[PDB]
Amino acid sequence: IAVDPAPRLAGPPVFGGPGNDAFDLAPVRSTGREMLRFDFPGVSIGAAHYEEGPTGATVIHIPAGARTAVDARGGAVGLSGGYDFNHAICLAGGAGYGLEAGAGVSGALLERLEYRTGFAELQLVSSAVIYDFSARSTAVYPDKALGRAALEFAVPGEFPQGRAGAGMSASAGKVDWDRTEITGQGAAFRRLGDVRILAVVVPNPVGVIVDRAGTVVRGNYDAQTGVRRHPVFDYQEAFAEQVPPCTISAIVTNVRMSPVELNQFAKQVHSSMHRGIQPFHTDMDGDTLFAVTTDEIDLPTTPGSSRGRLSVNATALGAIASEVMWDAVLEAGK
Amino acid sequence: DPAPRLAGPPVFGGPGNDAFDLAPVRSTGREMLRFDFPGVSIGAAHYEEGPTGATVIHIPAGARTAVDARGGAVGLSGGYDFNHAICLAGGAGYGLEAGAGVSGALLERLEYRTGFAELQLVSSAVIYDFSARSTAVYPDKALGRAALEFAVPGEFPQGRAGAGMSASAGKVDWDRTEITGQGAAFRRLGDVRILAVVVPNPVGVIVDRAGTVVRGNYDAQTGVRRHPVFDYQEAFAEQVPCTISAIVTNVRMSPVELNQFAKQVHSSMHRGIQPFHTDMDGDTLFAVTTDEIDLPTTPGSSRGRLSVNATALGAIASEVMWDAVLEAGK
């Protein structure tokens, strides 16, 4: 993944501006910088934005419904539903206001079900948000209309990389706002003997995006030096001086996992993201990962292979999925 | 032995929101509870088309909150540790949209400021009230906004009002389920204020302090209500082989104290709702403090050496909540 070295500073935040009804808001189908194509029947992605924000929503639609585990960390989580079974996952900007996009998805799915309301027929949408108001001078947020649009725009086997959907105004590196850079959204996909793994991420971290060599590639760009340093350098200097003597993501797979296995898998993959995002899981962050299984293929009963006695299990799947997710984070930062 | 209010056999569908020009109605319920709690407002609105509604507790200053959620059918949005409003609604997960109406309205009242510390925080919870009516209408953004607009200090509409319009109890069998309502109770002790608000839509039944089943699981064949355990035990012998609530106070409590308080009060509701906290329920309690009054540094009184602390307040608030549950079932 060839990350662009060039800066994309978000610029100084004003923390307000016109809101939704100031505009005749037309949803735009987000195309981003490039399209990822993937083969995962039953999983569709739609992304829609308002240019007037700019802000957007990204919807993962799984009409069969799929078992889900939710892993939320940090002090600024913005989550609706958080269900253990979902027909859609809605990721959006606009902080807590943007949870309204998920209502637009929910209402649209109820209409599609011809207003059936049996308990077993409830259409379940979990939503999570990023605080993207630092990155733009408006108060526009993903509303019901934008969530419904994202669901209507959902295509099988495509994902718009970059500044698209929820990633429109995502940004990283918030030691100081003058060093914060626009990120984007990202996705990656791997197929391994029939096994399918899709990672979707919208990194809006306090921390920075880091590649596999340990280089900081997005966030904390100091325009006085022309480089990005790990935040810890700023934090340690800040302490010598003053104390002298928000990433939302989904990992979707077709491998059957029990509720316990799936929850453990979610925690493992989520923690793994502290490789590519640093710091991560902070009090300042609202990090929410959804781990979704479409329950299509079984792990073998015993975990052995020629690569080891403990080589084929949900931990192994978690390790593989963790790499897919790191690739998706790097696509968001590219 | 109150007269039955059987909900009747569910259809699980009928016309939805898009079929009507939905008109919010200010809910008045069967009677108004009046109380004195500065800085707290309550609004309730409903659609007769459902019937279904939303009840909003507005604390404009914002208040520290603990959330305690139990069971397999929880429907929650936000669940924040600090809230400007709590939105309770029918319509199952679809009715979480009412809370978005409140949130958007509060952003407009803030003149569209978006600083992190100025975010307007609304936590919402819902009941599944589609079994109790033959429509698919749900509380929408417009209904949550209306509930906020209708909010006033010091009033609560008891009974079939707001989120309580189509709440119901006793779900061993839908033929024995009865309409409940919403309820509130208030106590003042010196400067200490405790308000309880509840929307009991339980699988279980409402039980009074004597142990009498007073709402839910009414058999029209017998004219009597039954505790569900009698039905369950006989079911086993033969075959083998949600409540959303808020407790609001003015007593300062640390985050740890507040969260322990929330769990205590919530568990206490298994006295008045039985069974409770079941996998079939989505029970969600919000414990909210306006942080106005300090507890003493030491817990003693003439009533005992360990008599004034958060456990104590929890025990008192538990009784206020039982009273609210009984109002909802009346």
Swiss-Prot record, chain A:
What does the record give as the active site? 246
Catalyzed chemical reaction(s): [N-(6-aminohexanoyl)]n + H2O = [N-(6-aminohexanoyl)]n-x + [N-(6-aminohexanoyl)]x
Q: Name one GO molecular function term.
A: aminopeptidase activity
Q: How does activity depend on pH?
A: Optimum pH is 6.5-7.5.
| Matches recorded under CDD domains | DmpA_OAT (cd00123)
Gene Ontology BP terms? nylon catabolic process
Q: What is the effect of changing residue 96 to S?
A: Decreases thermostability by about 10 degrees Celsius
A Pfam short name: Peptidase_S58
Q: InterPro entries this protein is in? A: ArgJ-like_dom_sf, Peptidase_S58_DmpA
Q: How is it modified after translation?
A: Expressed as an inactive precursor that is cleaved autocatalytically at Asn266/Thr267 to generate an active enzyme composed of an alpha subunit and a beta subunit.
Annotated signal peptide: none
Question: What keywords sit in the KW lines?
Answer: Hydrolase, Nylon degradation, Plasmid
SUPFAM superfamilies, per the entry: DmpA/ArgJ-like (SSF56266)
Q: Recorded E.C. number(s)?
A: 3.5.1.117
Q: What pathway does the annotation place this protein in?
A: Xenobiotic degradation; nylon-6 oligomer degradation
Which consequence is recorded for altering residue 122 to A?
A: Decreases thermostability by about 10 degrees Celsius
Q: How does it assemble?
A: Heterotetramer composed of 4 alpha/beta heterodimers. Exists at the monomer/dimer/trimer equilibrium in aqueous solution.
The task this protein performs is described as:
Involved in the degradation of nylon-6 oligomers. Degrades cyclic and linear oligomers of 6-aminohexanoate (Ahx) with a degree of polymerization greater than three by an endo-type mode. Cannot use Ahx cyclic dimer or the Ahx linear dimer.
- Protein family according to the UniProt entry: Belongs to the peptidase S58 family.
Instruction: Please name the PANTHER family in this protein's record.
Output: BLR5678 PROTEIN, D-AMINOPEPTIDASE
What is the name of the protein in this document? 6-aminohexanoate-oligomer endohydrolase
Q: Per the UniProt entry, what species is this protein from, by scientific name?
A: Paenarthrobacter ureafaciens
